[PDB]
Amino acid sequence: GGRLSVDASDIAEASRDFGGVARAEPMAVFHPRAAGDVAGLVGAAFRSARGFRVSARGHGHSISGQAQAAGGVVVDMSRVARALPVHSAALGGHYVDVWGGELWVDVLNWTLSHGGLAPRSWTDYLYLSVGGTLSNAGISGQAFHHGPQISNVYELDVVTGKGEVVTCSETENPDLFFGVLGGLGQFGIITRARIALERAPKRVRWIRALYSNFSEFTADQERLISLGRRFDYVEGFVVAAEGSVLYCLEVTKNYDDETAGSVDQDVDTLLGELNFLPGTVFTTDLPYVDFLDRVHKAELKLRAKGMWEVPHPWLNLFVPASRIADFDRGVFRGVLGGGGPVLIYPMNKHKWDPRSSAVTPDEEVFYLVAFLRSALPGAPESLEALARQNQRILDFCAGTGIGAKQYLPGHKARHEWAEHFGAARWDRFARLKAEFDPRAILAAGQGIFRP
Numbered sequence: 001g002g003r004l005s006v007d008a009s010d011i012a013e014a015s016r017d018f019g020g021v022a023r024a025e026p027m028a029v030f031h032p033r034a035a036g037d038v039a040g041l042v043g044a045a046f047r048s049a050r051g052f053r054v055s056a057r058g059h060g061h062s063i064s065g066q067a068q069a070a071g072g073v074v075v076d077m078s079r080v081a082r083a084l085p086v087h088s089a090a091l092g093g094h095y096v097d098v099w100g101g102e103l104w105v106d107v108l109n110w111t112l113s114h115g116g117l118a119p120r121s122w123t124d125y126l127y128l129s130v131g132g133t134l135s136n137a138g139i140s141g142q143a144f145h146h147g148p149q150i151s152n153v154y155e156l157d158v159v160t161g162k163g164e165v166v167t168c169s170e171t172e173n174p175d176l177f178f179g180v181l182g183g184l185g186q187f188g189i190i191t192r193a194r195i196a197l198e199r200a201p202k203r204v205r206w207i208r209a210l211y212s213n214f215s216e217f218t219a220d221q222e223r224l225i226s227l228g229r230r231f232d233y234v235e236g237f238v239v240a241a242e243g244s245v246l247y248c249l250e251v252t253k254n255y256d257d258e259t260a261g262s263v264d265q266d267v268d269t270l271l272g273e274l275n276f277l278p279g280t281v282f283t284t285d286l287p288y289v290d291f292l293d294r295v296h297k298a299e300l301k302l303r304a305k306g307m308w309e310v311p312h313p314w315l316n317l318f319v320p321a322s323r324i325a326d327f328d329r330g331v332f333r334g335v336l337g338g339g340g341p342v343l344i345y346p347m348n349k350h351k352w353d354p355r356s357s358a359v360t361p362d363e364e365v366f367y368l369v370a371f372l373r374s375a376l377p378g379a380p381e382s383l384e385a386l387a388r389q390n391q392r393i394l395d396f397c398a399g400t401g402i403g404a405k406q407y408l409p410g411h412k413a414r415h416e417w418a419e420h421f422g423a424a425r426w427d428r429f430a431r432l433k434a435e436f437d438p439r440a441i442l443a444a445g446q447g448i449f450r451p
């Protein structure tokens with residue numbers, strides 16, 4: 001059903017990612033029409049004498065070659081009749097079946113046009129594949145309340161490393177279901193995901209407020225994620241004094257025709273309880289789709305300046321709330337003291353299922369700290385200096401015993417992976433690999449296992 005391609009542009013695309021550093025080339029790019037085509041290719045890899053590498057590529061947003069299959073085959077999962085949202089009286093809500101390669105932006109547009117429904121949990125950027133985010137976590141300002149995207153999926157169809165198509169959920173083949181979720185593509189290729197949906201808000205009241213005091217900033221973020229009147233989105237970012245560091249709190253209040261008359265007072269009541277700097281509240285009112293697509297608008301302005309297709313040495317850390325104060329002193333004021341955002345916001349561990357493959361710190365409240373800096377165009381030394389700064393951040397966490405965990409981990413050494421997972425989780429991860437991908441065919445670019 002599918003076709004192997006040796007088109008130079010297809011090979012070049014499959015040999016790069018948003019990170020702009022890793023460049024392992026496959027022999028071919030596979031364009032499937034359906035799940036059975038992916039099953040056929042993985043099946044052939046499992047049966048082959050050499051056991052060539054097979055990796056699914058979402059939208060190629062990996063930082064360090066995680067979707068690359070050196071001298072093997074890259075499956076171009078990009079997109080055919082689409083399933084309509086479905087109501088279930090047993091689940092108490094709606095769901096939608098999506099192809100693993102579908103972009104979240106296309107999922108949103110589909111569910112809105114078919115009943116004004118939408119996923120409850122997002123990523124900041126919607127030009128990411130469903131299978132791609134579900135293999136990591138998929139995090140944004142909604143995760144404190146709904147959990148990451150891996151906590152908002154009912155079922156999957158997975159093509160294992162043996163080329164077998166398996167339907168899994170909490171009730172059917174749960175070890176495969178929970179293993180695949182946050183599983184870094186190690187146990188199979190997601191060909192279908194059954195996404196949880198809610199009736200979509202029509203509009204968003206988008207607020208930003210500034211802080212000079214990190215203790216007040218974090219205390220307000222932690223209080224907001226514990227909230228009943230509440231914001232629907234809680235993020236934050238680190239700001240340089242030139243418009244000394246400032247912290248910007250970023251919140252939203254979702255509303256529709258019914259709640260439009262109470263939105264102004266809900267916002268005012270919530271804001272009155274906060275300790276931001278007076279006169280620093282900035283507000284925007286816009287459609288729900290426009291808010292969700294805000295990062296793609298930043299992307300178009302970057303592509304126009306030749307500032308998008310540059311190296312991205314991005315670093316993402318989960319930091320226990322008990323160590324966040326020390327983190328600001330040594331990192332925001334220390335390492336980074338003196339191009340790209342630095343995001344920071346807490347989340348609730350109870351919204352993360354411990355049965356999944358996702359690795360979070362051993363604390364109920366933890367922060368995501370996202371160092372999203374870009375190197376200068378055509379300037380290799382800029383990338384090198386940013387890479388040294390990232391190593392200084394990791395050395396700082398190691399040196400002060402901060403139990404930080406990397407999100408989208410870029411580890412390569414076996415002892416680094418053992419340390420990342422810890423003994424219990426590593427044992428469960430290795431046993432899943434032995435069962436579902438014994439020949440280590442899948443997502444070898446993650447650098448965890450070898451044939």
Ligand SMILES: *Cc1cc2c(cc1C)nc1c(=O)[nH]c(=O)nc-1n2C[C@H](O)[C@H](O)[C@H](O)COP(=O)(O)OP(=O)(O)OC[C@H]1O[C@@H](n2cnc3c(N)ncnc32)[C@H](O)[C@@H]1O
Pocket residue numbers: 018055056057058059060061062063066067068077100101122123124125127128129130131132133135136137138139140184185188189190191408443445446
């Ligand atoms: C580039 C980028 C990334 C990003 C983001 C904004 C930008 C500009 N904003 C994010 C956000 O707000 N929240 C978040 O959680 N992540 C965010 N990201 C990072 C993003 O989640 C990751 O890059 C992730 O990998 C998804 O990106 P993508 O869809 O492009 O997937 P990939 O890079 O090609 O593949 C990643 C790994 O997953 C395996 N894979 C891919 N598809 C599948 C399927 N269908 N089944 C199983 N495994 C799959 C790849 O082989 C690779 O190992």
Ligand SMILES: O=C(Nc1cc(Cl)cc(OC(F)(F)F)c1)Nc1ccccc1CCO
Pocket residue numbers: 124125139140141235295298299302314316341343368370372408
């Ligand atoms: O890329 C992210 N946000 C994002 C936010 C803004 Cl305002 C601009 C932006 O511009 C650019 F050019 F794309 F960088 C990106 N987020 C992300 C990335 C990886 C892991 C986790 C995260 C979630 C952190 O909330």
